[PDB]
Amino acid sequence: DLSGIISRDQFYKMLKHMNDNDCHAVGFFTYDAFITAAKSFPSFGNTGDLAMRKKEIAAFFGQTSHETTGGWSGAPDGANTWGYCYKEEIDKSDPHCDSNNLEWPCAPGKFYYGRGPMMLSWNYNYGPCGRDLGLELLKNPDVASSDPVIAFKTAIWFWMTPQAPKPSCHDVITDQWEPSAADISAGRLPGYGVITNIINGGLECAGRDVAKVQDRISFYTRYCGMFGVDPGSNIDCDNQRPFN
């Protein structure tokens, strides 16, 4: 299974500062929770040859490490060793409630700020995620940051789920996505860049936030080196139009 693609040793070598006193979610994100969560998504890390499976895992941790990073220029061992420092958004002031969404209504008093490795946010994402995971995330979003299995499940759910016009990150990284004519025109080609685009393209790609994109790339390149895989082509999204 996945344990033969990413070992416990590898997991903690990647996330080598997350259990440091300087981080904020010490002991929360465990290797065991990761392996358990991945079982709800059997194709994740299990599609293709060993190099492809390792590249998928590197990409998943590259992106989620950025979403949860505590890194900066002077962080011990380098900024790209400080993934998984947070388990939820620092700024909790906004409930992230779209009261115009009728399918996934906001539960009164509840806040849908970012939680988990992918920083799942908004009632309209907690809703479908909860539906697909068989969990009451819309009524009780806080479970996404109190239970590390649920936390990882929300991240893997995001990774595996197409949200038109977007393919899933999974499909892109496993060479199962065939770009449309519109994608081609927009410079959206298979690679890590289009995964950044799927996750936060509107705020980062087309050169909108080079710093954030470079941090995403820095984690990914580090992890690819540790796994012994090539990060591949189209790693950046500075020449891609955001999806809509």
Query: Rounded to 5, what percent of the chain is helix, strand, coil?
Result: 45, 0, 55
Q: What is the CATH number of the domain that holds 177?
A: 1.10.530.10
- 64 with 15, same domain: the answer is yes
Q: Which of 56, 67, 89, 204 is catalytic?
A: 67
Q: Which of 97, 125, 146 finishes a domain? A: 146
Instruction: Look up residue 209 and give its amino acid.
Output: D
Are the CB atoms for 46 and 3 separated by under 8 Å?
A: no
- 82 with 141, same domain: the answer is no
- 136 with 171, same domain: the answer is no
- For residue 235 the two structure tokens come to 């790693």
- 10 with 111, same domain: the answer is no
Q: Which of 122, 146, 170 finishes a domain? A: 146
Helix (H), strand (E) at residue 181:
helix 181-185
Are the CB atoms for 118 and 154 separated by under 8 Å?
A: yes
Helix ranges restricted to H, the chain: 8-14, 31-38, 50-67, 123-133, 143-146, 148-160, 169-173, 181-185, 192-204, 210-227
Q: Quick one: DSSP state of residue 146? A: H
- Is 67 in the active site? yes
Is the bond into 190 cis (omega within 30 degrees of 0)?
A: no
- 75 with 188, same domain: the answer is yes
Per the structure, the count of domains in the chain is 2
Torsion over CA: 117, 121, 125, 126 (sign): positive
Q: Which of 121, 146, 171 finishes a domain? A: 146
| Domain assignment of residue 137, given as a range | 88-146
Instruction: Look up residue 125 and give its amino acid.
Output: N
Residues written for the chain: 244
Are the CB atoms for 188 and 194 separated by under 8 Å?
A: yes
Residue 93 CB partners (closer than 8 Å, separation 6+): none
- 164 with 243, same domain: the answer is yes
- 133 with 55, same domain: the answer is no
Using what technique was this structure determined?
X-ray
- For residue 39 the two structure tokens come to 């079982």
Are the CB atoms for 210 and 238 separated by under 8 Å?
A: yes
Question: What is the torsion angle, in degrees rounded to the nearest 10, for the CA atoms of residue 138, residue 144, residue 145 and residue 151?
Answer: -160
- 77 with 171, same domain: the answer is yes
Q: How many whole angstroms separate alpha carbon 60 and alpha carbon 195?
A: 9
- 26 with 106, same domain: the answer is no
